[PDB]
Ligand binder design. Structure first.
Ligand code: SAH
Ligand code: 5GP
Length: 259
């Protein structure tokens, strides 16, 4: 039984009030109030369709992932990672794909800076369409299940999925929902051998998720990197000063971009 499982159980043995408190004990947050209001108001400039923009930004401004050229955003959701990449210097084209439809986040049309370089389409199940060509491959797909083995299965489906989209020196940021389950650990070790990078924990993630992102421009022993998070999450179960620290949201400018 891996350390991460010991955690997942305690997580689950949590009560209504408890869980909610733990979910955010000492984590980083994005101040989205006004941005959400500007959007519900119909604004399409500056605002980020979600908090994923900020989340991606964290990896990007630390060169853990350097999006350039043709960017494919698997499970783009409302557009958070895509609209954000749409403003990055070296980016030429960004194509984001999602299931969408009733009961799922649907892409929000925006006019934020570089928007004209962004193609967003729902009604697409990435697990089956054929692989396209891409310089950078982003993927934030992975549904959380109270059942750790369910998550691991979902994570394996995602790994193999991106495995088919990764050519030789492609930039990537792939959400690895459950990296502690024996079996994902294995797959990851192989994936690392083939396409380098390492797993990295984003401070904007909630404690209720043991998610780590496989980012290209970073090294680190997989087993070692997954355990440092298992311990962190467990330490955070017992907190004093369980408050989150916020930070301003990302401003995505507005208007078109020329090449
Ligand atoms: N098999 C599949 N094919 C396509 N999209 C999928 C999928 N499984 C899940 N998704 C989508 O993946 C999304 C992940 S959450 C998206 C977060 C986004 N990067 C943000 O910044 O906006 C969900 O909105 C969901 O609809
Ligand atoms: N103990 C507890 N765990 C919860 C509760 N809600 C969600 N979780 C745990 O946290 C995981 C995903 O959290 P979520 O994105 O749904 O907040 C779930 O897979 C589950 O194991 C809750 O009320 N109590």
């Amino acid at each position: 039984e891996t350390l991460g499982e010991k955690w997942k159980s305690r997580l689950n043995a949590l009560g209504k009030s408890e869980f909610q408190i733990y979910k955010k004990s000492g984590i980083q947050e994005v101040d989205r109030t006004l941005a959400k209001e500007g959007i519900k108001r119909g604004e399409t400039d500056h605002h980020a369709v979600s908090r994923g923009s900020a989340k991606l930004r964290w990896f990007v401004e630390r060169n853990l992932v350097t999006p350039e050229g043709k960017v494919v955003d698997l499970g783009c959701g409302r557009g958070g990672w895509s609209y954000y990449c749409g403003g990055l210097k070296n980016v030429r084209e960004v194509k984001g794909l999602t299931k969408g439809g009733p009961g799922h986040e649907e892409p929000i049309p925006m006019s934020t800076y570089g928007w004209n370089l962004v193609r967003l389409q729902s009604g697409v199940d990435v697990f089956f369409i054929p692989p396209e060509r891409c310089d950078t491959l982003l993927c934030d797909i992975g549904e959380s299940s109270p059942n750790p083995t369910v998550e691991a299965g979902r994570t394996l489906r995602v790994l193999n999925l991106v495995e088919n989209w990764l050519s030789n020196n492609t930039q990537f940021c792939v959400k690895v929902l459950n990296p502690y389950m024996s079996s994902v650990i294995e797959k990851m070790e192989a994936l690392q051998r083939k396409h380098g990078g390492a797993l990295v924990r984003n401070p904007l993630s909630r404690n209720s998720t043991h998610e780590m992102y496989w980012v290209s421009n970073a090294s680190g022993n997989i087993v070692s990197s997954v355990n440092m998070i298992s311990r962190m999450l467990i330490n955070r179960f017992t907190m004093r000063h369980k408050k989150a620290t916020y930070e301003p949201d990302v401003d995505l400018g507005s208007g078109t971009r020329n090449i």
